[PDB]
Structure 1
């Protein structure tokens, strides 16, 4: 019935937003925020962080790799 035509997002450090445009012309803008962060070390100890907890520097630099901006367009003919 209804499907996606164009998408795009911009994710910051502690939140993100997704923009979507459908075939019928409607648009959906979804704002999302981080509720919890889980980090398992390479040797196997797990550590969960909360919505308000402070993040260490070596965790922040790894979270920076997730921050990105995407754009995709349906390009017929």
Structure 2
């Protein structure tokens, strides 16, 4: 969807805020985490380097390496808020 903020997160990857509130992080290994706003159903969509996508909702426990990676998203959300104007 339309990026409204995008920042490089050194040592982690590239983070994007999409126009409808989803936050995505593309990690250095090609994995992607999408954090879905609670208003849109919440949860996490995680795509492995091999292309496999999994949705983790409320009540799903997060396996390795998803749990630790999702644990980094709050700090990245704050970085996106203070991100420069895109461009």
Q: Answer yes or no: same fold by TM over 0.5.
A: no
Question: Which structure has the bigger radius of gyration?
Answer: 1
The structure where helix makes up a greater share of residues is 2
Higher relative contact order (CA 8 A, sep 6+): 1
The structure where strand makes up a greater share of residues is 1
TM-score range, shorter chain: 0.3 to 0.5
